[model samples]
Target: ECLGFGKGCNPSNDQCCKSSNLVCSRKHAWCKYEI
Candidate 1:
């Protein structure tokens, strides 16, 4: 899946990953998106 911080990535939630200085990784959930 495309991560919210990368191109073609879109989040259904309120966090703007790139703008928020966040990244994406998969663990139990999409938990690694926050700095």
Candidate 2:
């Protein structure tokens, strides 16, 4: 499954994030979306 911002992700790849989302840094843990 694809990944979203704020979600737990790895640098293994960069094709997981969706247009509306992005793989956020480890500082936070959860799907990254507009607040």
Candidate 3:
């Protein structure tokens, strides 16, 4: 899933897959994603 200011930043502002992979396309104030 995607997460960010426009996508609802959680606290990591990073992109991640359901498989528990972190792949941030860009950087922002807040972040999202879990492992």
Candidate 4:
């Protein structure tokens, strides 16, 4: 599960969330693994 750095530079933090009821940051946290 890749996130955050997948897309190009984000300004205004726009285009960061998906329209399918999934916030990008939420997804990022959801996929986090303990090291």
Candidate 5:
């Protein structure tokens, strides 16, 4: 499943969301949209 804001998403750990709009905010290993 894709992830939303406040969700866990670590790109470096192969945990990126399943959507183009979702970005793995590595700053806190959380999912969020690009600003």
Candidate 6:
């Protein structure tokens, strides 16, 4: 999965897996892009 925030978030601030959850909770939106 190509995260949108590529090299955007700090890798030492206070997060581990900074996966772009921009898709999180948007189950309906991703259905279209899945194609």
TM-score of every prediction relative to native: 0.26, 0.31, 0.19, 0.19, 0.53, 0.18
Tens digits of per-residue lDDT, candidate 5, 1-35, equal 66766688676753546566667776788976776
Winner on lDDT between 3 and 4 is 3
lDDT of 2 at 11: 44
Q: Give Cα distance to truth, residue 32, candidate 6, Å.
A: 25
lDDT of 4 by residue, 1-35 (tens): 32333344233343433433333234433322222
lDDT of 6 at 3: 32
- Ordering by lDDT: 5, 2, 1, 3, 4, 6
Clashing pairs in 5: none
Q: What TM-score does prediction 5 earn?
A: 0.53
Lowest lDDT 10-residue stretch of candidate 2:
23-32
Residues 1-35, candidate 1: write the lDDT tens digits: 32454433223442334555654443333525454
Best model per lDDT: 5
Decide which is better by TM-score, 3 or 6. Answer: 3
TM-score of 3: 0.19
lDDT of 5 at 20: 64
Q: List per-candidate RMSD values in Å.
A: 8.6, 3.7, 7.0, 8.6, 2.4, 11.0
Displacement of residue 12 (Cα, Å) in model 5 is: 1.8
lDDT of 6 by residue, 1-35 (tens): 33342223332332323343332123322211111
Stretches of candidate 4 exceeding 4 Å from the true structure: 1-5, 17-35
Q: Pick out the ten consecutive residues of candidate 3 with the lowest summed lDDT.
A: 4-13
Query: Candidate 3, residues 1-35: lDDT per residue as tens digits?
Result: 45432343334434534354434434543433434
Q: Which stretches of candidate 6 lie over 4 Å from their true place?
A: 1-7, 14-35
lDDT of 2 by residue, 1-35 (tens): 67755556554444445777564443454454544
lDDT of 1 at 13: 45
